[PDB]
Motif scaffolding. Sequence first.
Motif, PDB file in Angstrom:
ATOM      1  N   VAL A  76       8.320  19.498   4.485  1.00 51.35           N
ATOM      2  CA  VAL A  76       8.704  19.619   3.091  1.00 51.35           C
ATOM      3  C   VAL A  76       8.666  18.295   2.354  1.00 51.35           C
ATOM      4  O   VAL A  76       8.975  18.255   1.170  1.00 51.35           O
ATOM      5  CB  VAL A  76      10.087  20.261   2.970  1.00 51.35           C
ATOM      6  N   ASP A  77       8.297  17.211   3.023  1.00 51.89           N
ATOM      7  CA  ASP A  77       8.194  15.881   2.443  1.00 51.89           C
ATOM      8  C   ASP A  77       9.535  15.384   1.934  1.00 51.89           C
ATOM      9  O   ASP A  77       9.631  14.771   0.878  1.00 51.89           O
ATOM     10  CB  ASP A  77       7.142  15.844   1.348  1.00 51.89           C
ATOM     11  N   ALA A  78      10.582  15.635   2.705  1.00 53.89           N
ATOM     12  CA  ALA A  78      11.895  15.117   2.348  1.00 53.89           C
ATOM     13  C   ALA A  78      12.061  13.657   2.722  1.00 53.89           C
ATOM     14  O   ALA A  78      12.097  12.778   1.863  1.00 53.89           O
ATOM     15  CB  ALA A  78      12.959  15.928   3.038  1.00 53.89           C
ATOM     16  N   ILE A  79      12.232  13.398   4.004  1.00 54.50           N
ATOM     17  CA  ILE A  79      12.314  12.041   4.479  1.00 54.50           C
ATOM     18  C   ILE A  79      10.990  11.355   4.213  1.00 54.50           C
ATOM     19  O   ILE A  79       9.918  11.923   4.430  1.00 54.50           O
ATOM     20  CB  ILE A  79      12.707  12.032   5.953  1.00 54.50           C
ATOM     21  N   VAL A  80      11.067  10.136   3.730  1.00 53.63           N
ATOM     22  CA  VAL A  80       9.936   9.316   3.436  1.00 53.63           C
ATOM     23  C   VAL A  80      10.309   7.900   3.807  1.00 53.63           C
ATOM     24  O   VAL A  80      11.452   7.611   4.140  1.00 53.63           O
ATOM     25  CB  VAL A  80       9.501   9.393   1.972  1.00 53.63           C
ATOM     26  N   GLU A  81       9.331   7.021   3.737  1.00 47.52           N
ATOM     27  CA  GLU A  81       9.522   5.608   3.970  1.00 47.52           C
ATOM     28  C   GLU A  81       8.997   4.869   2.757  1.00 47.52           C
ATOM     29  O   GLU A  81       7.809   4.950   2.440  1.00 47.52           O
ATOM     30  CB  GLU A  81       8.820   5.184   5.240  1.00 47.52           C
ATOM     31  N   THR A  82       9.883   4.189   2.075  1.00 44.76           N
ATOM     32  CA  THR A  82       9.576   3.488   0.862  1.00 44.76           C
ATOM     33  C   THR A  82       8.848   2.193   1.147  1.00 44.76           C
ATOM     34  O   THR A  82       8.907   1.666   2.256  1.00 44.76           O
ATOM     35  CB  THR A  82      10.830   3.157   0.113  1.00 44.76           C
ATOM     36  N   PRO A  83       8.138   1.655   0.159  1.00 42.41           N
ATOM     37  CA  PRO A  83       7.624   0.297   0.283  1.00 42.41           C
ATOM     38  C   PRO A  83       8.672  -0.787   0.206  1.00 42.41           C
ATOM     39  O   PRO A  83       8.330  -1.954   0.401  1.00 42.41           O
ATOM     40  CB  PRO A  83       6.669   0.210  -0.879  1.00 42.41           C
ATOM     41  N   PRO A 110      -5.230   0.405  -4.329  1.00 43.47           N
ATOM     42  CA  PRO A 110      -5.250   1.565  -3.438  1.00 43.47           C
ATOM     43  C   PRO A 110      -4.429   2.736  -3.910  1.00 43.47           C
ATOM     44  O   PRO A 110      -4.718   3.869  -3.512  1.00 43.47           O
ATOM     45  CB  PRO A 110      -4.708   0.995  -2.133  1.00 43.47           C
ATOM     46  N   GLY A 111      -3.392   2.504  -4.690  1.00 43.68           N
ATOM     47  CA  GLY A 111      -2.599   3.558  -5.275  1.00 43.68           C
ATOM     48  C   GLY A 111      -3.143   4.124  -6.564  1.00 43.68           C
ATOM     49  O   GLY A 111      -2.438   4.888  -7.229  1.00 43.68           O
ATOM     50  N   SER A 112      -4.365   3.754  -6.951  1.00 42.81           N
ATOM     51  CA  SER A 112      -5.002   4.306  -8.139  1.00 42.81           C
ATOM     52  C   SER A 112      -6.458   4.675  -7.874  1.00 42.81           C
ATOM     53  O   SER A 112      -7.256   4.745  -8.813  1.00 42.81           O
ATOM     54  CB  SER A 112      -4.908   3.325  -9.304  1.00 42.81           C
ATOM     55  N   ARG A 113      -6.821   4.915  -6.634  1.00 42.67           N
ATOM     56  CA  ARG A 113      -8.189   5.273  -6.334  1.00 42.67           C
ATOM     57  C   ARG A 113      -8.475   6.667  -6.885  1.00 42.67           C
ATOM     58  O   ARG A 113      -7.714   7.595  -6.606  1.00 42.67           O
ATOM     59  CB  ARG A 113      -8.442   5.255  -4.833  1.00 42.67           C
ATOM     60  N   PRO A 114      -9.535   6.854  -7.680  1.00 37.86           N
ATOM     61  CA  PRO A 114      -9.896   8.215  -8.088  1.00 37.86           C
ATOM     62  C   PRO A 114     -10.241   9.140  -6.938  1.00 37.86           C
ATOM     63  O   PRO A 114     -10.065  10.355  -7.068  1.00 37.86           O
ATOM     64  CB  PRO A 114     -11.094   7.991  -9.001  1.00 37.86           C
ATOM     65  N   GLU A 115     -10.740   8.612  -5.827  1.00 39.35           N
ATOM     66  CA  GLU A 115     -11.295   9.427  -4.755  1.00 39.35           C
ATOM     67  C   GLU A 115     -10.263  10.268  -4.039  1.00 39.35           C
ATOM     68  O   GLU A 115     -10.642  11.088  -3.200  1.00 39.35           O
ATOM     69  CB  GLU A 115     -11.999   8.539  -3.741  1.00 39.35           C
ATOM     70  N   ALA A 116      -8.985  10.056  -4.287  1.00 35.07           N
ATOM     71  CA  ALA A 116      -7.948  10.835  -3.647  1.00 35.07           C
ATOM     72  C   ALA A 116      -7.766  12.226  -4.224  1.00 35.07           C
ATOM     73  O   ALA A 116      -7.199  13.085  -3.544  1.00 35.07           O
ATOM     74  CB  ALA A 116      -6.645  10.096  -3.759  1.00 35.07           C
ATOM     75  N   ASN A 117      -8.183  12.463  -5.464  1.00 33.40           N
ATOM     76  CA  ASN A 117      -8.067  13.798  -6.032  1.00 33.40           C
ATOM     77  C   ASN A 117      -9.145  14.736  -5.520  1.00 33.40           C
ATOM     78  O   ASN A 117      -8.885  15.926  -5.334  1.00 33.40           O
ATOM     79  CB  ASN A 117      -8.126  13.729  -7.549  1.00 33.40           C
ATOM     80  N   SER A 172       0.822  -1.187   0.000  1.00 29.17           N
ATOM     81  CA  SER A 172       0.000   0.000   0.000  1.00 29.17           C
ATOM     82  C   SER A 172       0.866   1.249   0.000  1.00 29.17           C
ATOM     83  O   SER A 172       2.020   1.207   0.428  1.00 29.17           O
ATOM     84  CB  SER A 172      -0.931   0.042   1.206  1.00 29.17           C
ATOM     85  N   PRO A 173       0.347   2.362  -0.491  1.00 34.66           N
ATOM     86  CA  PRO A 173       1.090   3.613  -0.424  1.00 34.66           C
ATOM     87  C   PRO A 173       1.449   4.037   0.968  1.00 34.66           C
ATOM     88  O   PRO A 173       2.467   4.707   1.168  1.00 34.66           O
ATOM     89  CB  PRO A 173       0.113   4.583  -1.058  1.00 34.66           C
ATOM     90  N   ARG A 174       0.630   3.691   1.936  1.00 38.77           N
ATOM     91  CA  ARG A 174       0.905   3.995   3.318  1.00 38.77           C
ATOM     92  C   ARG A 174       2.015   3.136   3.903  1.00 38.77           C
ATOM     93  O   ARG A 174       2.433   3.399   5.029  1.00 38.77           O
ATOM     94  CB  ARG A 174      -0.366   3.828   4.126  1.00 38.77           C
ATOM     95  N   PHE A 175       2.508   2.137   3.180  1.00 40.38           N
ATOM     96  CA  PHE A 175       3.480   1.214   3.734  1.00 40.38           C
ATOM     97  C   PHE A 175       4.778   1.917   4.093  1.00 40.38           C
ATOM     98  O   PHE A 175       5.161   2.927   3.508  1.00 40.38           O
ATOM     99  CB  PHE A 175       3.774   0.072   2.772  1.00 40.38           C
ATOM    100  N   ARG A 176       5.440   1.353   5.093  1.00 43.34           N
ATOM    101  CA  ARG A 176       6.612   1.920   5.735  1.00 43.34           C
ATOM    102  C   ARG A 176       7.725   0.884   5.723  1.00 43.34           C
ATOM    103  O   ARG A 176       7.713  -0.057   6.517  1.00 43.34           O
ATOM    104  CB  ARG A 176       6.282   2.344   7.148  1.00 43.34           C
ATOM    105  N   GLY A 177       8.670   1.069   4.814  1.00 41.33           N
ATOM    106  CA  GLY A 177       9.862   0.264   4.737  1.00 41.33           C
ATOM    107  C   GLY A 177      11.133   1.075   4.841  1.00 41.33           C
ATOM    108  O   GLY A 177      11.322   1.828   5.793  1.00 41.33           O
ATOM    109  N   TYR A 199       4.144   7.800  -6.839  1.00 40.88           N
ATOM    110  CA  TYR A 199       2.882   7.084  -6.841  1.00 40.88           C
ATOM    111  C   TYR A 199       2.271   7.068  -5.456  1.00 40.88           C
ATOM    112  O   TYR A 199       1.085   7.349  -5.271  1.00 40.88           O
ATOM    113  CB  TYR A 199       3.105   5.659  -7.292  1.00 40.88           C
ATOM    114  N   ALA A 200       3.075   6.712  -4.471  1.00 37.84           N
ATOM    115  CA  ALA A 200       2.561   6.600  -3.125  1.00 37.84           C
ATOM    116  C   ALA A 200       2.155   7.954  -2.578  1.00 37.84           C
ATOM    117  O   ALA A 200       1.209   8.057  -1.796  1.00 37.84           O
ATOM    118  CB  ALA A 200       3.603   5.957  -2.226  1.00 37.84           C
TER     119      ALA A 200
END
Lengths: 126, 191, 233, 242, 45, 182, 123
Positions: free
Chosen positions: B143-150, F49-56, B73-78, B182-183
């Motif tokens: 500023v969205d610098a540090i992030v956590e990749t999948p 989940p990374g292509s949901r239209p509802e996020a825009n 998921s985009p929310r994933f934290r790796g 993407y995430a």
Amino acid sequence: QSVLVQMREGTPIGLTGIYQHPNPRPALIALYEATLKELQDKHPKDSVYRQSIENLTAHRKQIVEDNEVSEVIENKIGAGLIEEVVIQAHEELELAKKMSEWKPWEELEEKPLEDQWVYFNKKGVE
Amino acid sequence: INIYAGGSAAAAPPAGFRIHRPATWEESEEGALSKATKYFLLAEMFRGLYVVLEQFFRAPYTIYYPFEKGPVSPRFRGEHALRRYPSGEERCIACKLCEAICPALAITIDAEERIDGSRRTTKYDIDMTKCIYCGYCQESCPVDAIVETPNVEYATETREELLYNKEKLLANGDKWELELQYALDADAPYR
Amino acid sequence: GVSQDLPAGLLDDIYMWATQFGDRLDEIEELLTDNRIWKLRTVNIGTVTAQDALNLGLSGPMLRGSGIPFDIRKNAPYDAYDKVDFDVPVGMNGDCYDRYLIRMAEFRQSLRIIEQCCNDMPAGAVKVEDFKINSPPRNLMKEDMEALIHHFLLYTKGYSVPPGETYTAIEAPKGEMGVYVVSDGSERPYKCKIRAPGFAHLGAFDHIARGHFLPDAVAIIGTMDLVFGEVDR
Amino acid sequence: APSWENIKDIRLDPKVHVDEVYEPIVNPADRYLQHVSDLHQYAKYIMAALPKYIQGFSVWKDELTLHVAPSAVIPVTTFLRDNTSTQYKSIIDITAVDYPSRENRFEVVYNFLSVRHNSRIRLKTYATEVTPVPSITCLYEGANWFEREAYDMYGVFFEGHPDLRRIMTDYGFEGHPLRKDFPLTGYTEVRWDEEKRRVVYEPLELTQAFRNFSAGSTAWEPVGPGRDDRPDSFKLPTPKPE
Amino acid sequence: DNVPAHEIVSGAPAELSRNRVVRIYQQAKPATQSGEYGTFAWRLD
Amino acid sequence: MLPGGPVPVFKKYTVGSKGIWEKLRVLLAIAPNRSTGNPIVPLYRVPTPGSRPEANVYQDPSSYPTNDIAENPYWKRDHRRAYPQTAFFDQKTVTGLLELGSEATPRIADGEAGTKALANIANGGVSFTQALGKSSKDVIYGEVLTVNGLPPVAPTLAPKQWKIIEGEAAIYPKGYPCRTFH
Amino acid sequence: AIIATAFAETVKFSGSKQELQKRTLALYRQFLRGAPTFADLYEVQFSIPTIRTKIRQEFERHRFVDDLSIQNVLYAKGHMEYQECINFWKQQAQFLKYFPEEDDIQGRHQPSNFVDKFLKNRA
Ligand code: SF4
Ligand code: SF4
């Protein structure tokens, strides 16, 4: 004289360790009278402990004397089933006999130091 | 209506609380030979075995990991990463909020005035052996610098390859930028 | 409250899993419930009385197997367990079999609750609207000043809790979990004791296992299913 | 005719539309006022009933606390376990707390529960590093482990305990951790000595030192004085001006 | 005198008692700010 | 049927059988209602989940009186600085409520006389047992105990009247040693 | 009821020095009688007399403590350690914490005068 508080065998009611009590009401009455005796004898009249337990035992005893059904007595005495009421009676009586030896009605034995019981509320310490 | 002595209408027992009674062998509405057959031919046992067999003929759940990965998921934290602007400049400004909120105190930063008069870092470390992967560090950064990749495929043979420095993070962000975009495009509105 | 809101297309998938979960629970019940050996290993084992279960601090299914209907979710609802229907199983005999039946009943009643909540998830915020406690959105932190200040302070110093103290508790699946927090007007706690139900369970294990053989000791620890990271706090 | 291949695609089903969300503004403590007046009356009864022991009582948001002294623990617990109106049969927790500013730095805390009446109550004492506390294992067997914990964590000694010994900390640990004088990291650490071929305990040395960050603590008072919620039946009367 | 030696039951080393110094103090009022809440407490370091 | 099943297969969102194999499964199944449990690929987790239209279209949610921009002062919806104080009552503060009364039921003299009357109790001038014995029946039976004379019980914030469900609604049938409470 | 383990003594705070004298002496006696068990259970590389010497040293440590409550605390802690050792709860490491001396000489320079401490920045 002796009394049966708790049958640990026999027909099970819905609690485990507690089982059906044959002839509860006489045992409740004897235990309530013994508690009233210990209080009327060993405790001061002007103590709130005595008056509270006295009105409590008198009211529960009236509900036990006027009523015959146990289900009704339970719906009146709002403390579990009747087999739990007998245990409440026993525990209250033993507490009375213990409190006759201690003296809760007396004045404070240990007075706390002023430093005790201060919790982060005095506006000038942090 | 009612006055109570050391009790209440709540603590009064439920109407039917008193269980009826245990049934005996008499008052058994199932003949002795019926329950004898169920006793000697092991009925419920055969039933359980058949419920087992039906699974033998059903689709297994297994996936082949290195060729087919599981859901992410985009929310994933790796793994961690330090991003850049499209200009090529780095986003970190040494606000040191990631260094403060981090529960494990993994992060270690040291800034100074850059030659062009700006605020930037000369040291940014992460001990991934201290990290718990909480994501508070991608939450604090304004500023969205540090992030956590999948990414999760970054095991090593040594414990000193896990003391990531700034260069190892900037390259990791140059590498995963497309995945991070993407995430972020599907996580930022909720964040 | 909550960190971030639900993503789109989650209640649907939950509803799918929910429509299919009762079957799999039933497939488990087929093997375990009516079986002989499971009963032989769980009938009249780990048997504990009501009064003992109370004296020992036991909660959860260990207590509801003795016959006492206690469930904090009903006697002290906290989140929304007062605004959603469910039933609390109770059992006699205090054995392991009754606790297993309670646990399966809690599976199914929780499924009922999930269905209801999916059918009624109100709109609104998922977190308190007081930016002195909860971090704001980012589209404000990057455009409004007070929001960026509050973000900075919450993510550096944190929020100042009033002085006080409290034990508050829940109906955790293991039992009655609880936290005893103390405050001193700072952003850092002064004390935090986690009351861990597996602790009292293991403590009663000596009272509960006396008289039983080793396979039964295994079954007893399994009734409690202690998670030893909790037991060790 | 119907099958999973003809199943309804719920993902397209119309979804609720809410224009404005309406959440009323409310204090969470107005919910508690009547229960609080009740707890005040109950505490007053208990203080009138056991004046020898009860020093005081506090109330805060459906939580009661009774302040006592180490002598008064067994008696008051007997009252709270056996009395009809207060059948506090379950022992939820025991906890100590360190307040070094006090003479008696420790403050042992019992929490109790009544499944009968659906209520909790607290009970606080005080102690020192050398002054013990009576053990309530005579009544609540579950106190065994909790008192062993409080000993190992803070150093409090629970007199009458059949087997008081450490439970959490290492078998040879020397110190009581949750004391405010005890450093976070402790005094010792372990490594494998290839020579002796034994896990050996050595003085602490960290490769990254502890950074506290409690020095950024706020210089301005964050939450001012609260708001009285004492019921007027427990407020000391103001004499009429004349 | 008669001040108890809890150092014997503390379980801590003796080097703290024999070689190490503490300082008791109030945090000074910062000049970078005008607040005074961090004061009024006697730190020991 | 009840509000909790049973439900057929063509409403469960699982990958099943098709054709003669379905007839065979419904024949050879202990419960033909039951599912394989494999989710249906077109539906489950689609769109990803990374292509949901509802996020825009998404925007940070809010509630009205807190998003109101005009008559929404913070000092009215500051519930933290309105926190209820931790009251403390030692025996001194309780005997004054006994010898004297309270703002709701005063029994105190007017003027500096009553002020020093409070002062006599602020210090150790009168004790708790003394004013427990100096308390008339209307005092105790109405401010310590109840009017009926019975002591108060451990209060409940949110009482629970239990009820039993038996028979068909119950989670388990009659034979099993578990029951069901509402 | 949760019953006590093997060598458990109930915590009981004596009101007099004359009784605690006796209790401490019984503890010392038990340590000495049990020292061979402390040598068998823990794979020890030295003498039973050296264990008894260390025990005497540990009891001489607090020989000059006149506050009664502190003595009661010390006695309770010592009974805890006897219970820990005689029941095989401790492993070798936690036991040989009490015997640093028996292990090989740690290096050469062990400063004892000023100048060496100064050259090693330990003064
Ligand atoms: S997410 Fe990882 S690196 Fe960031 S603060 Fe948490 S533990 Fe540290
Ligand atoms: S929060 Fe972001 S900008 Fe600030 S120091 Fe950390 S990575 Fe750099």
